[PDB]
Amino acid sequence: QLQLQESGPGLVKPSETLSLTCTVSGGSISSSNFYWGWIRQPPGKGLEWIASITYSGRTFYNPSLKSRVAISVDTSKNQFSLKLSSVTAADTAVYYCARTFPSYYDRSGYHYLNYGMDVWGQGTTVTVSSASTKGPSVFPLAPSGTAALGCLVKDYFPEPVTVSWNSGALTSGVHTFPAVLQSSGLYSLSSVVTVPSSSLGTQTYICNVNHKPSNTKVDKKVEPKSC
Amino acid sequence: LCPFGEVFNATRFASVYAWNRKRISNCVADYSVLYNSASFSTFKCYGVSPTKLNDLCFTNVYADSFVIRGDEVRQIAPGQTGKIADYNYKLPDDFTGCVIAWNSNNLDSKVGGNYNYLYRLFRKSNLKPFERDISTEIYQAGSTPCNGVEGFNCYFPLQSYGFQPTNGVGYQPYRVVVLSFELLHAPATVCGP
Amino acid sequence: NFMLTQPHSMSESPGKTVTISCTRSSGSIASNYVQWYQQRPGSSPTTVIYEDNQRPSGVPDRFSGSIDSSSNSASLTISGLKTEDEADYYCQSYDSSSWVFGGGTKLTVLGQPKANPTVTLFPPSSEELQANKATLVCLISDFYPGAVTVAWKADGSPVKAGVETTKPSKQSNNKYAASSYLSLTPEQWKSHRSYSCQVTHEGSTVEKTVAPT
Ligand SMILES: *[C@@H]1O[C@H](CO)[C@@H](O[C@@H]2O[C@H](CO)[C@@H](O)[C@H](O)[C@H]2NC(C)=O)[C@H](O)[C@H]1NC(C)=O
C-alpha cells in the first residue's frame, strides 16, 4: 500500500541546482529496513540510477554523478529529496523516486542492501531551459449515435499538462493525445471525449486542464454548435 | 536453554490464517543450531545478522510458525504484498528478526491431496502487522447481501492448499518460523551464550 | 563498471514464449541479484522480477526469470504472450561500485489486425478567432500498423506551411494515435471555402473537411 509522489519545478536553468522531493504514504521513511532512491530517464532513452539513502544516513551514489548530488530524508514530512548542482541539458529527464527491496542478512551473515527497486513513483518531468514557464491557452472543440467534443490546450511550456473531464467524473471515451512540440519550442495538445449525441442538450461537459509548472488550472465548458 | 527445538521440530504446524505464536523469555538462546544448519530453503534476517545473535540480548523473542506454499515464502518479508502478507500473516515494515523456511513435502503432502492447511483468500482490508484473523464470515464480493451463506458473489473466505507430493516446488508445503527480536525499555531476558 | 547487454528489439505472436537476455560483460552474472522492470510508453516502470527469479505479487506467473552462467546472462521468459505485454523491459544489477541497467528491449506482439484510422477534424473555435488565431485540429486514432501520412488541403490546393504533426504513439488498446495541427491567420481561414485533413494509412485515404461558420 506504499505510494510515492514526486514533486519538482518542471524547469531549471543551466548551471542552477535542481531540487526534487518524494512524498511517501502508506509507509514510514524512517524505517531501518529500506533504501529510497532516485532513477532518471532522459527523453527516448534508458534508465539511470542516481543515489539511494536510508534514514540511519548511509548513502550510495552513482560515481559519475556523485560530486553534484545530495540526497536527504525529512521524517516529519515523510519525504526524501534530491539535489543536483550545476545542471546541463544532459539532466533533462523524467525523475522517479522508488523504495528498494528490504535489506537483510543471509544465514552466513552477508548483508544485501540497495540492490533493486520494489515500489516506483509516478515520475516528475524536468526540462533544462533558459526560458520560464508559459501556461496554456484552452479553447473548446465543439461537437456538431456518438459525438466527439474536446479541448485544445495551446502554447505551453514545459511538459506536462493533464486533462480531466467533469472533475474526473467522466472517464469513459476520454482520449488525451500526446502533445506536439512546435517549431517555437512550445507544446500543444488536445483532449477529446466521445459521448452519446442525445446527451448534448442536457449533459454539461467541462475540461479541467492542469499545468503544474505554471500553477495554471483552467476549466473550459464545451458547448454544442447550433448553425 | 530456550525451547527452539519445540518450535522448529513440532510434529504439527498451524495453517497460516491461524498462525501460531510462542513467546520465548528468561532463557539462553543458542542460535548456532539454526545458522549452522544447511537444511533451510530460506534464511533471511532483518535488522540483525544471524552470525551476531549469540553475542546479543533481547527483552523477548517471539516464534511464529505456519505452513504456506513454496512461491509464497517471498511474501514473509517487510514491505511485501499478496494474499499471504495482506490477509494471513503480515510483518511490520520495521521488523527485526529472522524468517526461516524449509520444504515440508515429506510431512505435509498426501497422495490425493492434503486439504488440512488453509489460507484466507478474501478480506475487507489488509491485516495490521502481527494481526491474526480466524473468522469464517461469508465474504461479500459484490453488491448483494450474503445472509450468512455462500451464493451469488458471496464466498467462504478460507481456501485449502490441497498439497499433493507430486506438485511443483512452488506448490509444495513449506514450514515457516518467524523469530521476532524485541527491544523494550525493560531488562533483557533472552541472551546468547 | 560492467555493461548489461540486451537485444534492442524483439517480436513474437500471442500465446508464444519470448526470452529476453541480459549479458554481463565482466564478473559472474550470479555474483549479484538481477531485476527486471517493465515500462509501457508514458508510464512508470514496474518491477516484474527481483533476486533473479522472484515475482512480485500482482505479476502474472507466465513471467519467469533465470540465470545462465554459461553465457553469463540473465533471462526474462514471458510465456503465453498477451498483447498487454508490449512494453520496454530493462534488466538491472549492481556490485559494490554502482548499479548497472541494461539498455532496454522493446517487445512487439505480432498478429494485430489492420485497422484504418478514425479522423476527427475541428475548425477554429469562435474564442480562438476572437484571439486572432485559427488552429485546425486533426485527431487520428485507432490505426494499426502505426504509420500514417497527413496531407492538408486549402480548397483543393496543397497546404505547404503551418503544419505540425506528431509521431504515432501507442494507445492503451495497443493501436496508435497521432495529431496534426494547421496554423492559419484569420484571413487565410475566412478566404478559403474549406480546408481538409487527408490521412493515408496502408494505401487507403480517410479525409475530413471543415469550413467557416
Ligand atoms: C530439530 O531436530 C533436528 C534433528 O534431530 C536437530 O538437528 C541436529 O542438530 C545438532 C545441532 O544441535 C546437529 O549437530 C545434528 O547433527 C543435527 N542432526 C540432524 C539429523 O540434522 C535440530 O537441531 C532441531 N532443531 C532445533 C531448533 O533444535
XYZ file of C-alpha atoms and ligand atoms in Angstrom:
661
model
C 0.000 0.000 0.000
C 3.104 2.202 -0.319
C 2.630 5.163 -2.665
C 5.405 7.571 -3.752
C 4.776 11.042 -5.219
C 7.491 13.174 -6.835
C 7.354 16.973 -6.847
C 9.670 19.186 -8.892
C 9.873 22.608 -10.565
C 9.214 21.447 -14.177
C 12.062 23.748 -15.285
C 15.605 24.573 -14.224
C 18.175 26.862 -15.863
C 21.579 25.580 -16.951
C 24.168 25.895 -14.128
C 21.383 26.185 -11.442
C 20.504 23.474 -8.880
C 17.651 21.032 -9.381
C 15.689 20.143 -6.187
C 13.130 17.320 -6.180
C 11.036 15.891 -3.342
C 9.359 12.462 -2.929
C 6.414 12.266 -0.502
C 5.733 8.782 0.873
C 2.362 7.468 2.006
C 1.458 4.005 3.275
C 4.879 3.589 4.889
C 7.428 5.483 7.022
C 10.598 6.984 5.545
C 12.320 6.341 8.942
C 12.157 2.506 8.510
C 15.609 0.834 9.040
C 14.823 -1.972 6.521
C 14.623 0.092 3.291
C 16.598 2.383 0.972
C 14.946 5.154 -1.005
C 16.389 6.232 -4.318
C 16.185 8.271 -7.483
C 16.271 6.925 -11.060
C 16.039 9.068 -14.180
C 15.192 8.614 -17.861
C 16.171 11.185 -20.485
C 13.635 11.580 -23.361
C 13.573 8.396 -25.519
C 16.481 6.830 -23.512
C 17.119 4.229 -20.810
C 17.116 4.219 -17.002
C 19.997 5.544 -14.814
C 20.300 5.197 -11.024
C 21.357 8.427 -9.243
C 21.582 7.666 -5.478
C 19.890 5.898 -2.563
C 19.640 6.696 1.160
C 18.326 5.148 4.375
C 17.316 7.153 7.487
C 20.347 5.953 9.538
C 22.202 8.141 6.966
C 24.071 5.549 4.889
C 24.085 6.785 1.264
C 25.097 5.274 -2.082
C 25.836 7.275 -5.216
C 26.287 6.745 -8.964
C 30.016 7.546 -9.158
C 29.617 9.556 -12.411
C 27.085 11.978 -10.784
C 28.285 11.762 -7.144
C 30.066 15.108 -6.854
C 26.849 17.036 -7.972
C 24.386 15.009 -5.814
C 22.946 15.447 -2.369
C 20.184 13.183 -1.047
C 18.418 13.627 2.296
C 15.460 12.483 4.421
C 12.820 14.558 6.354
C 10.884 12.151 8.642
C 8.326 14.670 9.951
C 7.141 15.315 6.333
C 7.653 11.628 5.338
C 9.831 12.887 2.461
C 13.192 12.335 0.829
C 14.855 14.752 -1.583
C 17.385 15.051 -4.399
C 19.679 17.966 -5.123
C 21.639 18.025 -8.424
C 24.017 21.001 -8.730
C 25.221 22.720 -11.934
C 22.635 21.171 -14.240
C 23.188 20.889 -18.006
C 20.997 19.788 -20.960
C 22.133 16.211 -20.090
C 19.988 16.462 -16.906
C 16.669 16.876 -18.833
C 14.792 13.709 -17.841
C 11.859 12.143 -16.050
C 12.974 11.563 -12.454
C 11.440 8.677 -10.486
C 11.599 8.090 -6.739
C 11.460 4.481 -5.568
C 11.735 2.252 -2.473
C 14.209 -0.649 -2.644
C 13.631 -4.235 -1.664
C 14.390 -4.568 2.068
C 17.934 -5.018 3.392
C 18.722 -8.364 5.007
C 21.427 -10.744 6.131
C 21.662 -14.350 4.856
C 22.475 -17.349 7.107
C 26.264 -16.738 6.534
C 25.935 -13.095 7.742
C 26.348 -11.476 4.258
C 24.407 -8.138 4.005
C 22.200 -7.443 0.960
C 21.009 -3.834 0.607
C 20.083 -1.239 -2.002
C 20.100 -3.826 -4.835
C 16.843 -3.152 -6.742
C 13.627 -1.113 -6.797
C 10.375 -2.569 -5.475
C 7.859 0.314 -5.499
C 8.129 3.117 -8.093
C 6.732 6.647 -8.085
C 4.846 8.449 -10.864
C 7.828 10.389 -12.268
C 8.329 14.171 -12.453
C 9.443 15.683 -15.784
C 12.397 18.095 -15.608
C 13.357 20.236 -18.625
C 16.646 22.226 -18.516
C 15.905 25.564 -20.266
C 16.857 29.252 -20.370
C 13.075 30.082 -20.538
C 10.480 30.488 -17.744
C 7.159 28.603 -17.641
C 4.409 29.570 -20.086
C 0.872 28.478 -19.141
C -1.622 27.111 -21.726
C -4.488 28.846 -23.524
C -7.517 26.481 -23.574
C -10.165 26.560 -26.359
C -13.290 24.413 -26.727
C -13.612 21.914 -29.619
C -17.417 21.947 -30.069
C -19.327 18.887 -31.273
C -21.639 19.168 -34.366
C -25.052 7.778 -32.137
C -21.890 9.454 -30.728
C -20.315 12.925 -30.862
C -16.667 13.988 -30.351
C -16.050 17.124 -28.280
C -12.785 18.322 -26.882
C -10.424 20.943 -25.528
C -7.387 22.399 -27.350
C -4.558 23.195 -24.918
C -2.250 25.581 -26.779
C 1.238 27.026 -26.453
C 2.519 25.883 -23.007
C 5.988 25.131 -21.686
C 7.288 22.812 -20.322
C 5.588 19.373 -20.259
C 3.358 18.071 -18.958
C -0.315 19.038 -18.856
C -3.104 16.810 -17.572
C -6.765 16.975 -18.645
C -9.777 15.581 -16.776
C -13.464 15.872 -17.758
C -16.200 16.907 -15.248
C -13.591 16.879 -12.429
C -12.800 13.143 -13.010
C -16.495 12.067 -13.130
C -16.274 11.436 -16.920
C -13.555 8.839 -17.802
C -15.268 6.616 -20.443
C -14.480 7.648 -24.043
C -11.754 10.180 -22.923
C -8.671 10.351 -25.183
C -5.922 12.893 -24.319
C -3.485 12.939 -27.248
C 0.268 13.271 -26.820
C 1.443 16.854 -27.313
C 3.006 18.334 -30.438
C 6.370 20.073 -29.974
C 6.015 23.218 -32.142
C 8.960 24.689 -34.084
C 8.759 27.596 -31.455
C 9.517 25.029 -28.699
C 6.052 25.390 -27.116
C 3.701 22.387 -26.781
C 0.055 21.967 -27.702
C -2.248 19.027 -27.117
C -5.936 18.087 -27.478
C -8.242 16.011 -25.255
C -11.416 14.545 -26.893
C -14.347 12.751 -25.245
C -16.796 10.609 -27.319
C -20.338 10.847 -25.791
C -23.899 9.948 -26.865
C -25.389 12.612 -29.278
C -28.621 12.519 -27.185
C -26.720 13.773 -24.050
C -25.650 17.062 -25.750
C -28.859 19.041 -24.921
C -28.788 18.255 -21.161
C -25.307 16.939 -20.002
C -22.627 19.643 -19.229
C -19.023 18.871 -20.417
C -16.112 20.776 -18.837
C -12.389 20.052 -19.398
C -10.139 20.609 -16.371
C -6.613 21.468 -17.571
C -3.689 21.481 -15.101
C -0.191 22.740 -15.895
C 1.679 22.292 -12.577
C 4.889 24.109 -13.699
C 2.939 27.410 -14.197
C 0.464 26.565 -11.360
C -2.277 27.002 -14.059
C -5.724 25.404 -13.593
C -8.346 26.184 -16.295
C -11.909 24.801 -16.576
C -13.453 25.238 -20.025
C -17.124 24.454 -20.742
C -17.575 22.835 -24.181
C -20.977 23.680 -25.721
C -22.578 22.143 -28.827
C -22.616 24.135 -32.117
C -26.060 25.500 -33.287
C -25.738 26.526 -37.008
C 18.227 -23.149 27.075
C 15.424 -21.502 25.001
C 12.990 -24.106 23.559
C 13.630 -23.527 19.777
C 13.504 -27.338 19.281
C 9.796 -27.399 20.370
C 9.023 -24.711 17.713
C 11.119 -25.947 14.766
C 10.549 -29.707 15.359
C 6.805 -29.555 16.318
C 5.073 -32.596 14.706
C 2.030 -30.337 13.801
C 2.203 -26.814 12.259
C -0.623 -24.221 12.121
C -2.490 -23.088 8.980
C -1.145 -19.611 8.089
C -4.536 -17.883 8.706
C -4.378 -19.357 12.270
C -0.601 -18.897 12.644
C 0.917 -19.953 15.965
C 2.974 -17.647 18.258
C 5.294 -18.885 21.025
C 6.770 -16.273 23.417
C 10.390 -17.050 24.396
C 11.763 -15.321 27.523
C 14.144 -15.831 30.526
C 16.429 -18.361 28.730
C 19.800 -18.791 26.942
C 19.427 -18.858 23.147
C 21.956 -20.881 21.115
C 21.146 -19.624 17.550
C 24.060 -21.664 16.008
C 21.700 -24.744 15.887
C 19.824 -22.610 13.287
C 22.589 -20.710 11.378
C 24.952 -23.774 11.185
C 22.141 -25.868 9.549
C 22.119 -26.329 5.701
C 18.520 -27.799 5.915
C 16.678 -24.440 5.345
C 15.484 -23.179 1.929
C 15.073 -19.527 3.152
C 17.053 -17.850 5.950
C 16.769 -14.061 5.888
C 17.356 -11.747 8.860
C 16.180 -8.106 9.043
C 17.969 -5.520 11.209
C 20.297 -8.176 12.737
C 22.928 -10.627 11.404
C 22.458 -14.251 12.488
C 26.302 -14.580 12.897
C 25.973 -11.891 15.706
C 22.875 -13.310 17.563
C 24.957 -15.404 20.024
C 26.540 -12.037 21.185
C 23.165 -10.176 21.672
C 20.390 -9.792 24.337
C 16.635 -9.112 23.699
C 13.675 -8.340 26.003
C 11.517 -11.044 24.340
C 11.791 -13.383 21.306
C 8.550 -14.431 19.583
C 8.476 -17.510 17.366
C 5.573 -17.539 14.864
C 5.047 -20.680 12.754
C 2.796 -21.872 9.942
C 2.666 -23.607 6.532
C 2.378 -21.886 3.138
C 3.318 -22.936 -0.382
C 6.843 -22.510 -1.771
C 6.195 -19.497 -4.065
C 4.546 -17.587 -1.118
C 7.666 -17.677 1.174
C 8.850 -14.388 -0.519
C 5.704 -12.700 0.956
C 7.074 -13.215 4.527
C 9.284 -10.120 4.281
C 8.938 -6.449 5.173
C 7.003 -4.387 2.615
C 5.647 -7.350 0.685
C 2.112 -7.759 -0.635
C -0.064 -10.627 -1.841
C -2.746 -12.885 -0.364
C -0.450 -14.163 2.451
C 1.059 -10.787 3.501
C -2.257 -8.908 3.023
C -4.803 -11.332 4.552
C -2.905 -14.042 6.566
C 0.454 -13.031 8.171
C 1.926 -9.522 7.976
C 5.431 -8.484 9.049
C 5.894 -4.870 10.110
C 7.931 -2.603 7.839
C 10.349 -2.095 10.809
C 10.661 -5.876 11.507
C 13.752 -7.060 13.414
C 14.152 -10.814 13.195
C 14.694 -13.865 11.037
C 12.432 -15.637 8.517
C 13.381 -19.328 8.259
C 11.667 -21.787 5.929
C 12.102 -25.336 4.680
C 10.319 -27.716 2.297
C 7.862 -29.979 4.244
C 6.555 -32.055 1.255
C 7.544 -35.283 3.110
C 5.325 -34.352 6.143
C 2.522 -32.112 4.793
C 1.605 -33.542 1.319
C -0.677 -36.628 0.912
C -1.474 -38.730 -2.196
C -4.951 -37.469 -3.217
C -4.099 -34.045 -1.650
C -3.766 -32.853 1.995
C -6.598 -30.271 2.439
C -5.985 -29.633 6.195
C -3.871 -26.438 5.522
C -5.997 -23.331 4.714
C -5.304 -19.703 3.822
C -7.579 -16.672 3.735
C -8.341 -15.674 0.098
C -10.754 -12.767 0.756
C -10.813 -9.958 3.345
C -12.372 -6.462 3.512
C -8.998 -4.882 4.464
C -5.323 -5.788 4.943
C -4.036 -7.216 8.273
C -2.035 -4.915 10.529
C 1.438 -6.251 11.411
C 1.201 -9.392 13.608
C -2.645 -9.369 13.419
C -4.458 -12.726 13.308
C -7.926 -13.225 11.803
C -9.576 -16.678 12.405
C -13.144 -15.502 11.482
C -15.210 -17.519 8.929
C -17.848 -14.930 7.920
C -19.102 -15.158 4.312
C -17.255 -12.560 2.223
C -19.438 -10.140 0.180
C -17.632 -9.754 -3.229
C -20.500 -7.928 -4.991
C -23.336 -5.539 -4.061
C -25.980 -8.106 -2.883
C -26.088 -9.265 0.769
C -24.970 -12.818 1.697
C -27.404 -13.570 4.599
C -24.590 -15.735 6.131
C -24.467 -18.301 3.226
C -22.349 -18.853 0.126
C -24.091 -17.738 -3.077
C -24.181 -15.036 -5.711
C -20.918 -13.098 -5.210
C -20.768 -14.458 -1.584
C -17.757 -16.702 -0.845
C -16.385 -18.693 2.097
C -13.199 -16.719 2.875
C -10.779 -19.632 3.504
C -9.423 -21.910 0.748
C -7.460 -25.188 1.063
C -3.953 -25.638 -0.386
C -4.504 -29.283 -1.326
C -0.792 -30.345 -1.204
C -0.003 -33.439 -3.340
C 3.564 -34.803 -3.112
C 3.783 -34.689 -6.913
C 3.188 -30.831 -7.115
C 5.890 -28.458 -8.471
C 8.086 -26.972 -5.663
C 6.229 -23.589 -5.835
C 3.022 -25.560 -4.870
C 4.669 -27.794 -2.231
C 4.221 -27.072 1.501
C 6.927 -25.066 3.363
C 7.127 -24.782 7.135
C 7.999 -21.243 8.241
C 9.326 -19.936 11.552
C 9.494 -16.173 12.084
C 11.744 -15.141 15.027
C 10.985 -11.575 16.273
C 13.780 -9.966 18.417
C 12.163 -7.331 20.638
C 13.998 -4.481 22.485
C 11.720 -2.718 25.015
C 12.836 -0.117 27.636
C 12.899 -3.090 30.111
C 15.517 -5.716 31.197
C 16.892 -8.163 28.532
C 15.722 -11.756 29.368
C 16.861 -13.675 26.188
C 20.654 -13.682 25.644
C 23.121 -15.724 23.539
C 25.806 -17.752 25.451
C 31.610 -0.745 -14.033
C 30.328 -3.707 -16.146
C 27.782 -3.486 -19.021
C 24.493 -5.406 -19.284
C 23.671 -6.018 -22.960
C 20.062 -6.711 -24.079
C 18.666 -7.086 -27.576
C 17.271 -3.684 -28.719
C 14.003 -5.136 -30.195
C 12.080 -8.452 -30.241
C 8.750 -9.571 -31.827
C 6.584 -12.631 -31.024
C 2.974 -13.889 -31.566
C 0.336 -14.069 -28.778
C 0.382 -17.341 -26.842
C 4.053 -17.973 -27.678
C 7.112 -17.643 -25.465
C 9.749 -14.926 -25.738
C 13.056 -14.906 -23.783
C 14.971 -11.609 -23.325
C 18.701 -11.909 -22.444
C 20.892 -9.599 -20.355
C 24.610 -10.398 -20.760
C 27.113 -9.168 -18.080
C 30.393 -8.015 -19.733
C 32.657 -8.929 -16.703
C 32.283 -10.751 -13.395
C 29.768 -13.548 -12.865
C 26.089 -12.763 -13.585
C 25.411 -14.925 -10.450
C 27.594 -12.601 -8.217
C 24.776 -10.006 -7.810
C 20.940 -10.102 -7.964
C 19.287 -9.206 -11.273
C 15.945 -7.355 -11.502
C 13.657 -6.844 -14.486
C 11.466 -3.749 -14.947
C 8.581 -3.428 -17.426
C 7.735 0.054 -18.815
C 4.767 0.924 -21.049
C 5.021 4.195 -23.014
C 4.152 7.244 -20.826
C 4.081 5.067 -17.631
C 6.430 4.471 -14.677
C 8.438 1.263 -14.742
C 7.061 -1.652 -12.687
C 9.172 -4.468 -11.228
C 8.392 -7.896 -12.745
C 11.388 -9.956 -11.402
C 13.752 -9.425 -8.455
C 16.581 -11.518 -6.951
C 16.978 -13.249 -10.398
C 13.757 -15.310 -10.306
C 11.298 -13.909 -7.694
C 7.961 -12.462 -8.911
C 6.241 -9.619 -7.066
C 2.624 -10.200 -6.182
C 0.383 -8.911 -8.967
C 2.877 -10.100 -11.639
C 1.384 -12.863 -13.824
C 3.047 -16.318 -13.320
C 3.923 -16.519 -17.037
C 6.800 -14.077 -16.248
C 9.844 -16.003 -15.034
C 13.481 -15.113 -14.545
C 16.628 -17.209 -14.694
C 20.458 -17.015 -14.788
C 22.697 -18.815 -17.358
C 26.343 -18.778 -16.024
C 27.340 -20.465 -19.378
C 26.609 -17.258 -21.454
C 26.926 -15.064 -18.287
C 23.397 -13.766 -18.957
C 20.166 -13.318 -17.127
C 16.918 -14.118 -18.893
C 13.320 -12.953 -18.661
C 10.890 -15.510 -20.125
C 7.367 -14.416 -20.965
C 5.248 -17.472 -21.730
C 1.761 -17.245 -23.094
C 2.424 -13.766 -24.538
C -0.517 -11.269 -24.241
C -0.940 -8.042 -26.233
C -0.735 -6.294 -22.710
C 2.988 -7.400 -22.549
C 4.021 -4.929 -25.283
C 6.492 -2.749 -23.372
C 10.165 -1.919 -22.873
C 11.947 -4.347 -20.486
C 15.111 -3.371 -18.595
C 17.379 -5.679 -16.658
C 19.360 -4.250 -13.747
C 22.127 -5.456 -11.438
C 24.922 -3.889 -9.375
C 28.159 -4.534 -7.500
C 29.902 -2.685 -4.605
C 30.690 0.192 -7.076
C 27.302 1.103 -8.646
C 24.029 -0.064 -10.177
C 24.009 -1.106 -13.859
C 20.963 -1.049 -16.155
C 20.661 -2.900 -19.430
C 19.818 -0.704 -22.420
C 16.213 -1.946 -22.701
C 14.397 -4.309 -25.094
C 11.266 -3.120 -26.917
C 8.867 -6.089 -27.191
C 6.304 -6.093 -30.046
C 3.380 -8.628 -30.053
C 2.743 -9.730 -33.694
C -0.644 -10.668 -35.318
C -2.647 -7.432 -34.585
C -5.206 -6.840 -37.374
C -5.024 -3.921 -39.805
C -7.177 -1.022 -38.500
C -7.904 2.137 -40.555
C -7.619 5.438 -38.653
C -10.641 7.293 -37.242
C -10.211 11.003 -38.125
C -11.849 13.913 -36.255
C -11.257 17.436 -37.659
C -12.198 20.581 -35.679
C -12.279 24.086 -37.176
C -11.168 27.099 -35.158
C -13.339 27.980 -32.130
C -15.032 31.434 -32.172
C -12.995 32.116 -28.954
C -9.653 31.421 -30.722
C -10.679 33.590 -33.752
C -11.539 36.369 -31.209
C -7.832 35.966 -30.089
C -6.823 36.475 -33.814
C -5.709 32.837 -34.188
C -7.060 29.894 -36.210
C -5.913 26.307 -35.460
C -7.380 23.356 -37.373
C -7.072 20.181 -35.228
C -6.879 16.769 -36.992
C -7.073 13.887 -34.461
C -6.082 10.441 -35.829
C -6.759 7.352 -33.707
C -7.240 3.553 -33.529
C -4.911 2.741 -36.538
C -2.656 -0.301 -36.974
C 0.101 -0.613 -38.052
C 1.463 2.579 -36.507
C 2.359 4.704 -39.604
C 0.220 7.416 -41.290
C 0.873 10.295 -43.697
C -1.137 13.524 -43.356
C -1.874 15.984 -46.173
C -3.787 19.233 -45.732
C -5.723 20.978 -48.491
C -6.919 24.604 -48.819
C -9.936 24.246 -51.140
C -8.320 21.644 -53.474
C -4.735 23.102 -53.294
C -1.957 21.523 -51.183
C -1.065 23.318 -47.917
C 2.732 23.686 -47.740
C 3.216 25.716 -44.479
C 1.874 25.910 -40.906
C 1.505 22.114 -40.366
C 2.844 20.300 -37.281
C 2.195 16.560 -36.921
C 3.093 14.252 -34.023
C 4.866 10.853 -34.267
C 2.397 7.956 -33.871
C 2.192 6.732 -30.233
C 0.713 3.514 -28.790
C -2.710 3.942 -27.132
C -3.918 1.938 -24.058
C -5.554 -0.530 -26.510
C -2.245 -1.225 -28.457
C -3.447 0.705 -31.607
C -1.896 4.105 -32.459
C -2.798 7.776 -32.293
C -1.411 10.928 -33.923
C -2.468 14.582 -34.260
C -1.895 17.223 -36.903
C -2.318 20.984 -36.335
C -2.639 23.565 -39.117
C -1.985 27.212 -38.057
C -3.675 29.905 -40.195
C -4.129 33.629 -39.906
C -7.814 34.539 -39.546
C -7.693 35.942 -43.154
C -6.404 32.563 -44.535
C -9.259 30.712 -42.688
C -12.006 33.141 -43.910
C -10.663 33.493 -47.513
C -10.986 29.742 -48.499
C -14.248 27.771 -48.997
C -12.909 24.820 -46.968
C -9.876 23.065 -45.511
C -9.309 19.271 -45.493
C -7.186 16.859 -43.427
C -6.330 13.756 -45.557
C -4.905 10.765 -43.671
C -3.300 7.911 -45.700
C -2.821 4.516 -43.985
C -1.656 1.327 -45.850
C -2.586 2.955 -49.270
C -6.192 3.982 -48.195
C -7.066 7.713 -47.587
C -9.574 8.949 -44.925
C -10.453 12.703 -45.347
C -12.406 15.237 -43.273
C -13.366 18.787 -44.353
C -14.369 21.905 -42.331
C -15.462 25.424 -43.433
C -16.116 28.841 -41.859
C -19.464 29.027 -39.930
C 15.298 -30.321 15.175
O 15.706 -31.721 15.057
C 16.896 -31.927 14.280
C 17.124 -33.425 14.007
O 17.036 -34.150 15.231
C 18.044 -31.229 15.016
O 19.328 -31.433 14.383
C 20.593 -31.713 14.766
O 21.186 -30.594 15.444
C 22.503 -30.715 16.000
C 22.949 -29.325 16.444
O 22.493 -29.050 17.769
C 23.476 -31.283 14.968
O 24.820 -31.402 15.476
C 22.947 -32.625 14.479
O 23.858 -33.154 13.517
C 21.578 -32.438 13.835
N 21.025 -33.719 13.400
C 20.489 -33.880 12.181
C 19.892 -35.234 11.858
O 20.481 -32.957 11.373
C 17.698 -29.743 15.031
O 18.763 -29.032 15.632
C 16.412 -29.490 15.803
N 16.110 -28.078 15.751
C 16.233 -27.236 16.790
C 15.865 -25.802 16.516
O 16.599 -27.548 17.906
